[PDB]
Amino acid sequence: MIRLAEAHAKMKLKNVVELEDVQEAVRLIRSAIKDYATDPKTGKIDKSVIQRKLQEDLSREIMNVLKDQASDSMSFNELIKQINEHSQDRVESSDIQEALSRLQQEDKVIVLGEGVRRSVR
């Protein structure tokens, strides 16, 4: 990890290793290993039920926020810093994109321009 992250930082002519430059190092080391817990033989013939529940709970929480956030409009980025940063590691936030897209189909909220995100009347 260290001899490889410093090489990544050498690439791009970076003079000092950042923090968001060991993360792809971890990714690369995990290229080999991603898919087994107790026994090997990855297999992994690639929408899951637990993914369903993830989207669902995110929808719950974000609806509760945007209905508690009376200024019904806020950016995706502002919303992320409002929720996805309160605690442990940030989430993909494109799964958040699918969440808000559902809330457009269901029409519980309205993006209303990229700059903000409003809810429905």
């Binding site: 817990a37 033989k41 899951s48 039920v49 529940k53 993830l54 995110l58 605690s87 442990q88 590691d89």
Partner: protein, 425 residues
């Protein structure tokens, strides 16, 4: 007899009879016939030869239920009633014990209550001593002939006697019954004189349906719009569109061709239309009517579709998690047999493969402790025993019995495919 009046009471406030009610009333499964015509005459002449000439024979008939055969032999022995015999419906599936038949026999012969031993003793006695034809209905013979065929051995060795005042009308389910459990020696006495009953064609189904609808087809009632009562205040008429009857007959004749199934599905669509008409006017229970194709479409589709899919789409999220993990195991080990604790390990996997996401955090928390960090650190997930059971008893899952709950096996009774599809919704 004695208790029959004990079921008759007086308080009856003019029970309301609507149209489809009368329909189903004549459409009841109880009240010449077209489908079995030459069979009628064939068995009629068999019994005619056997009795009018005072002989004794064995009329074997077999075929799946619902082919009218019980009704058919009854019609034959009913027209024969008018022209010596004891119609004794010995139904093996009605006999409490297997031997109980004897006693009925042992009663109908003299009216005595002794054991099966003296029963058959005096029976054979009567069969070989009495100087000189009693139609004993061996309904659903299978039950009686299960232990060692001794029962049927007797029941036919009796028949083989020449001057035996004993005609038997045996009905079995399958054709090869005498050739798979009965003794060869028994099979011979059974003889080759067995009449087979085929299925029913949708033509015959139309015939029987219009028969049940003879006096009522497309007919007129006198219905008071106020109460919904029907009398065979406007004189309404009703048509039973024979196209739906056609399609029902076709569908039943396809897979089974059974009179019972067809009658019942017709009744079902009828009462569905009935409840819709009742709702549309609200008569409660105290211009022109019809039965569209769509009614029978629904009533018939409901007799085919299952619910396991529409059920598993409603189980607790814990259950769906369990099933999805089990499917991952099935495809990972290709064994379609998993170990229970192994499934627990896989559930742990599935929960942790996703990152420390706050939502995965909530899931981990609740699924391992209902919030309340005060009490936490469960080994196996919450309700896991409970959901396992809720599955097992529901016939979906199937598990062997070992008090060691980490190496006991588990298998899906349903198809893997339908389960996967259920996960996909």
């Amino acid at each position: 007899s004695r208790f029959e009046n004990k079921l008759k009471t007086t308080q009856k406030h003019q029970i309301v009879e609507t149209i489809f009610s009368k329909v189903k009333k004549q459409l009841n499964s109880s009240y010449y016939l077209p489908a079995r015509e030459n069979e009628f005459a064939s068995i009629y002449l068999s019994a005619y030869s056997a009795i009018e000439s005072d002989s004794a024979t064995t009329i074997y008939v077999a075929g799946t239920p619902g082919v009218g055969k019980t009704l058919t032999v009854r019609e034959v022995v009913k027209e024969l009633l008018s022209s010596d015999f004891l119609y004794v419906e010995i139904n093996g599936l009605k006999m409490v014990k297997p031997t109980d038949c004897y006693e009925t026999l042992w009663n109908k012969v003299s009216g005595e209550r002794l054991t099966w031993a003296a029963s058959m003793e005096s029976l054979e006695f009567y069969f070989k001593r009495v100087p000189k034809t009693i139609v004993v209905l061996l309904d659903e013979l299978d039950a009686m002939v299960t232990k060692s065929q001794d029962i049927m051995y007797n029941f036919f060795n009796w028949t083989t006697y020449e001057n035996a005042k004993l005609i038997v009308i045996a009905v079995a389910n399958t054709m090869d019954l005498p050739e798979r459990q009965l003794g060869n020696k028994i099979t011979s006495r059974i003889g080759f004189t067995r009449i087979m009953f085929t299925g029913y064609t949708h033509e015959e189904l139309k015939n029987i349906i219009d028969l049940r609808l003879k006096g009522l087809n497309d007919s007129f009632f006198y219905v008071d719009t106020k109460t919904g009562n029907a009398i065979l205040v406007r004189k309404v008429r009703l048509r039973m569109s024979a196209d739906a009857i056609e399609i029902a007959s076709r569908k039943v004749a396809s897979v089974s061709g059974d009179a019972r199934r067809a009658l019942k599905v017709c009744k079902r669509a009828a009462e569905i239309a009935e409840k819709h008409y009742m709702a549309k006017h609200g008569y409660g229970y105290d211009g022109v009517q019809t039965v569209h194709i769509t009614h029978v479409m629904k009533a018939l589709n409901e007799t085919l579709n299952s619910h396991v899919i529409t059920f598993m789409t409603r189980l607790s999220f814990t259950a769906k998690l369990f099933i999805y993990a089990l499917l991952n195991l099935m495809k990972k080990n290709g064994s379609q047999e998993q170990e229970l604790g192994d499934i627990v390990d896989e559930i742990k996997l599935l929960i942790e493969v996703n990152g420390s996401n706050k939502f995965v955090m909530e899931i981990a928390k609740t699924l391992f402790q209902q919030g309340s960090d005060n009490i936490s650190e469960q080994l196996r997930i919450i309700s896991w025993d409970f959901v396992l059971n809720q599955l097992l008893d529901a016939g979906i899952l199937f598990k062997q019995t070992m008090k060691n709950d980490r190496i006991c096996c588990v298998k899906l009774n349903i198809s893997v495919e339908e389960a996967k599809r259920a996960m996909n919704e």
